[PDB]
Amino acid sequence: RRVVVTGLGMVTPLGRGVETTWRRLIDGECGIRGLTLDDLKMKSFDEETKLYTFDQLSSKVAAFVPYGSNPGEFDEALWLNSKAVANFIGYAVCAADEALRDAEWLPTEEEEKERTGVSIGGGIGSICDIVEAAQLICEKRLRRLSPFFIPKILVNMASGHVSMKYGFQGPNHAAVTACATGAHSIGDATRMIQFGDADVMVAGGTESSIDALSVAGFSRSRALSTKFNSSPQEASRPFDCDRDGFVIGEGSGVIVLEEYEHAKRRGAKIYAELCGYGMSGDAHHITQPPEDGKGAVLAMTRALRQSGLCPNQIDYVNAHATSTPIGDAVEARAIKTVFSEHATSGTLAFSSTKGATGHLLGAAGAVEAIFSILAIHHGVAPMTLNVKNPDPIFDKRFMPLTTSKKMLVRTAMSNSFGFGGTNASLLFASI
Amino acid sequence: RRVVVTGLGMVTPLGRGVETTWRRLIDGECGIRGLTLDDLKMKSFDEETKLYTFDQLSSKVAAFVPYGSNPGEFDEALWLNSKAVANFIGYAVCAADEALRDAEWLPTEEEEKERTGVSIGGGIGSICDIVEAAQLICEKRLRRLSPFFIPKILVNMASGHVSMKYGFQGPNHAAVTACATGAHSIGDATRMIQFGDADVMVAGGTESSIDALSVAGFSRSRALSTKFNSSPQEASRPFDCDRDGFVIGEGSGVIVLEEYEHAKRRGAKIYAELCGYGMSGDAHHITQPPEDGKGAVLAMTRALRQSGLCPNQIDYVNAHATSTPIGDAVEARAIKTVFSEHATSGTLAFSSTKGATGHLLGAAGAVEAIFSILAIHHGVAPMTLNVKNPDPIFDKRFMPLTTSKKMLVRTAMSNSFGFGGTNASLLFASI
Ligand SMILES: [K+]
Ligand SMILES: [K+]
């Protein structure tokens, strides 16, 4: 059975909603800004502690979702109106609602509901809530501990809330694979529709981990940018010689997947087909990828094999490149190994959009799958921001896009690599 | 493509190793004991705060993995080595090593290593590590934050560590669905092998969340047992009239899934075939299942449909029953609905093993899948512990096993339900 995409939904640092997010992306906007004390998410702590904590953060930049009741903004009064709903859950529900309405899939009949599943995973969940609760132990004020604490920190709850809201009784699933979470969640959902576990799946990823401990943690791992704290708009620069770590972002990406015949029967407009779901493991290091990028090569190759397409048949690649010294170079190297001539000649189009959205972690793979689907749908490939001095590996021919260019895009591949060497590559095609 | 099990590995409150755990389980033993200050995992806190916290805990019972260098014990020196290894990671690696050696699968060939994947998820991760980091904020000592903090809290690292340990470059995945995590991780691995993503998968679940905040959190949610703090071994009593919540347990379950032909060609030992992976969502409440147990019914019915078997062909059912008033009753009604005459005849054998192991959360689904496989392999169905007064729903005929029954077990079903209404049902059969 074939699987197509009939609905898109998302909330990102470029805005709430696919239309607004895509328009701003293409036009070259950036959602990164400088951190403030409010961004620590430490409302339960005194100012002295906030000030101290802020100063301990090496990375002071991030990509935030715009809150508000205005158009293009995420309304917390609408999506975060429950004690059991953490931010990552609200982002997921917000995005899923847009996607479902886009696909016009809000069934009332039990049979349709029973054949609809959910697979939206979260990468970390809600460290903020855990820190607040932990503070209760340090200060001996456990009486404040809420019964909704456990429910709101479980990374699988984003999927639970979406199914409960729409009555979806099909597979209630969640894949958690660090920075690849969004990809595997969509991939697993696709495997489920293929096998027959469901006819419709609402899948994607969500992440809301911009806070004191999250920033301190990733900084301690030396994975975040710190060189451009005074110039945030220049912090995320995938493939650029001056990159020094990724910029933490937040948001969610959700798509509606469904069996091909099912979509045609009801006359739904189809964005594209999901033809490849390549998975692999680096089996190398907990945080660093192999110099040869074998894992990345495997993921992309497996996705190709599954689609029955040759390397030269791929028009666009949305690179994972998070603006990391080693990471970005390894992927560029893997792209050369996989597409060889097709890439070295300049025929292949590829870019990273994290320069604009930042690294959405658990949601990165979902949002980027949406961008890949949209490139095919609109025949426009997004630019890579801040590539002032291309990495030595690139040249006059093999070079990432630095401007959003019009072009026919019948096939698009999106890569996602997370900590622990977990790799996934999603391949989409027009149908 | 058929999928069989060729390797079993586990670390539980009943002992380290399948041999020990199974033996004690069948002999009607229990791994639950009373909580102490040391179990809070609050090494970085003073006595006064430990006492305060302990005093606030309504539930003072839990099931711990036995540590030691003697047979049947978990040697932390062999598994809890690096500073990047949290308990849930160590348990997973330990269990995986036993599962792989049992299946005699430690390939040196790149092809076989590339065709071997890992899918072991964690349900919560390492709360105690976050609590410790949080304390650094309250005490303004963030310079002591470990550079391995992030790698230690990522619930997907278990599959990452296992993969790099054996060089497995197949799909590096993890399914996180609360109490059903172990079941979905195994089911997703099965789908991957069926589709051709890999020929071998090391799948299961792991959990080690016995600490201050985990216990305080679950207690506040009113999900844990509290009336038997003075009689730990009596605290977990699935299907019993005096049940009052589950008992937090820790451990890991890992099995080796293999494509049928691949297993036969290498002359590998085969325990059974995984014939059904039924998934569903209650789409009801965040923590409570529907009175009619429709979700449970759908999950079991789906695994059945997938296997091509009818209810009367099922010999053993390992219920999820965590010793909860509403939960246990709901699943009991669901079982009766699904198997009707096969249940009311008294021939169908069913039981819950959580009275002995406690609720292993993320690992529950995997450990219990192993018990189901072992029931088929050994021809012995595990008893339900502490059923002094059977729930009113039961009678002379329709009654869970209260003694280990020697019987032919050709087929076995294992149910796993988690918060968010996420349901999974795994069906195994001799081959
Ligand atoms: K990507
Ligand atoms: K079970």
Curated annotation (Swiss-Prot), chains A, B:
SMART domains: PKS_KS. Inhibited by cerulenin. SUPFAM superfamilies: Thiolase-like. Disruption phenotype: Slow growth and bleached leaf phenotype when grown under ambient air, but normal growth under CO(2)-enriched air. Thicker leaves due to enlarged mesophyll cells when grown in ambient air and associated with altered thylakoid membrane assembly and starch granule ultrastructure; these phenotypes are partly reversed when grown in 1 percent CO(2) atmosphere. It catalyses: a fatty acyl-[ACP] + malonyl-[ACP] + H(+) = a 3-oxoacyl-[ACP] + holo-[ACP] + CO2; butanoyl-[ACP] + malonyl-[ACP] + H(+) = 3-oxohexanoyl-[ACP] + holo-[ACP] + CO2; hexanoyl-[ACP] + malonyl-[ACP] + H(+) = 3-oxooctanoyl-[ACP] + holo-[ACP] + CO2; octanoyl-[ACP] + malonyl-[ACP] + H(+) = 3-oxodecanoyl-[ACP] + holo-[ACP] + CO2. It is an enzyme of class 2 (transferase). Its main location: mitochondrion. GO terms for biological process: fatty acid biosynthetic process; thylakoid membrane organization. Belongs to the thiolase-like superfamily. Beta-ketoacyl-ACP synthases family. Mitochondrial protein lipoylation in leaves does not exclusively depend on the lipoate biosynthesis by KAS and may occur independently of this pathway in roots. This is 3-oxoacyl-[acyl-carrier-protein] synthase, mitochondrial. It comes from Arabidopsis thaliana (Mouse-ear cress).
